[PDB]
Amino acid sequence: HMPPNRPGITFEIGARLEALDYLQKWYPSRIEKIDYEEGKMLVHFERWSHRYDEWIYWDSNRLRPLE
């Protein structure tokens, strides 16, 4: 499947955005992996261990542009 177009975000590996972790805190983040079958992405919250990476659907409002 193809990712949606959303302003301020590019859905590609290594692209940067802001992402809401499961504690509802925003962090500058990086797209690590994209699952194009499910439409979800592995998001890495910067300066956190990769054990805290989270899978977020690419149309989620847990993702927003990084200014």
């Binding site: 972790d21 499961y22 504690l23 956190w48 261990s49 805290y52």
Partner: peptide, 6 residues
Amino acid sequence: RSKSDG
């Protein structure tokens, strides 16, 4: 830095 407490 961790994300849970107990």
